[PDB]
Design a protein around this ligand. Structure first.
Ligand code: OLC
Ligand code: OLC
Ligand code: OLC
Ligand code: OLC
Ligand code: 97N
Ligand code: RET
Ligand code: LFA
Ligand code: LFA
Ligand code: LFA
Ligand code: LFA
Ligand code: LFA
Ligand code: LFA
Ligand code: NA
Length: 224
């Protein structure tokens, strides 16, 4: 109990600092080509609002814990993970498009394909929820959930990446981190939840800090 709590406190700490940074980021002036970065950052802040609600719920609920509350995380992830996938698409498009591009152009052109990505991701989460609540066995959950995780990342890769190291870094770092949520599913209650608490720092908050630094680097002459 103490270690789930302490890791949640660490995760909260990084959330609060990150959110402050992200807010200032929204007001940094941007050149035409960089506007999509602010579009990304406001979606990451929305993700933060949801995440924070779950973590306050968690630390309160952990005071008197009798039930395995792990499943409640899925009510967060079903809202946050599609947003994160959209923002990943937008960042790849930003990195890889020669001309400036904004989210409206991407959404209007690709909404069907984006729905397929989010649908695959939804099936991954549904299978995990069934496993986490013990409606299917662990082995089926890991093979079915991993199948959909792969499919989601394959769809991402083949439409949105280019073959270069700045793509490989963004793509594989994320793919590995998301795969580690499946790895955590294997473990007993306390270890599993400690691993989700820290993984959320990496999968959400580090991404926001990354975007902030990209913004500050692109725009620092407009600031100074
Ligand atoms: C001035 C603003 C500081 C914001 C927070 C950044 C600095 C954080 C202080 C270091 C910290 O949190 O340390 C944890 C502790 O040392 C682990 O055992
Ligand atoms: C710790 C987090 C603070 C980090 C702030 C960075 C740049 C702030 C830029 C503020 C932009 C205001 C509008 C402007 O400068 O124009
Ligand atoms: C609208 C339909 C929504 C169905 C909801 C969840 C899928 C349940 C799938 C069946 C799971 C039963 C347990 C099992 O697979 O054993
Ligand atoms: C089970 C569901 C289907 C999987 C097949 C894989 C579908 C792969 C679709 C790839 C589409 C693609 O290449 O999109 C970018 C152009
Ligand atoms: C235009 C600049 C592009 C430079 C890209 C490579 C440069 C530096 C490395 C940045 C630090 C790691 C990448 C953060 C973005 C990312 O993958 O986070 C996913 C993470 O949340 C886990 O899911
Ligand atoms: C901010 C929260 C995030 C990014 C949560 C992500 C969760 C996953 C990628 C879950 C993955 C799973 C597997 C890979 C297999 C089946 C079990 C899951 C759902 C835990
Ligand atoms: C002993 C049980 C409780 C442990 C609490 C601390 C556990 C987590 C330690 C690391 C937390 C920060 C993780 C940062 C990201 C990991 C590496 C990212 C590379 C880019
Ligand atoms: C807006 C909020 C989105 C969902 C946040 C994550 C879940 C927080 C708890 C919801 C209630 C679950 C109670 C189960 C015992
Ligand atoms: C009290 C309100 C809790 C809200 C939790 C999240 C709601 C969306 C859950 C969707 C589940 C089915 C995909
Ligand atoms: C549990 C429910 C999952 C199994 C039934 C649906 C199978 C997935 C089919 C669509 C996946 C997402 C779209 C991929 C093709 C572009
Ligand atoms: C990418 C960061 C993942 C961090 C995993 C932390 C594992 C801690 C396990 C609980 C302590 C026993
Ligand atoms: C915590 C992650 C920081 C990553 C900074 C990357 C900035 C790249 C700018 C080009
Ligand atoms: Na459970």
């Amino acid at each position: 109990m103490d270690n789930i709590i302490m890791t949640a406190y660490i995760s909260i700490f990084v959330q609060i600092i990150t959110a402050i940074i992200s807010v200032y980021g929204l007001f940094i002036p941007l050149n035409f080509k960089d506007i999509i970065l602010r579009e990304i950052l406001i979606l990451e802040l929305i993700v933060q609002i949801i995440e924070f609600i779950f973590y306050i719920w968690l630390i309160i609920t952990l005071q008197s814990i009798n039930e395995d509350i792990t499943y409640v995380r899925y009510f967060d992830w079903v809202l946050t993970t599609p947003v994160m996938l959209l923002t990943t698409v937008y960042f790849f498009e930003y990195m890889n498009s020669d001309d400036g591009i904004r989210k409206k152009e991407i959404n209007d052109r690709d909404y069907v394909y984006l729905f397929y990505i989010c649908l695959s991701n939804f099936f991954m989460l549904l299978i995990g929820y069934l496993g986490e609540t013990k409606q299917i066995n662990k082995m089926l959950t890991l093979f079915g959930g991993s199948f959909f995780l792969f499919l989601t990342f394959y769809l991402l890769y083949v439409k949105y990446t280019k073959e270069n190291w700045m793509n490989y870094i963004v793509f594989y770092f994320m793919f590995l981190v998301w795969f580690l949520y499946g790895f955590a599913f294997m473990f007993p209650f306390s270890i599993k939840n400690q691993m989700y608490n820290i993984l959320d720092i990496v999968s959400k908050n580090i991404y926001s800090i990354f975007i902030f630094i990209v913004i500050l680097n692109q725009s620092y002459k407009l600031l100074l």
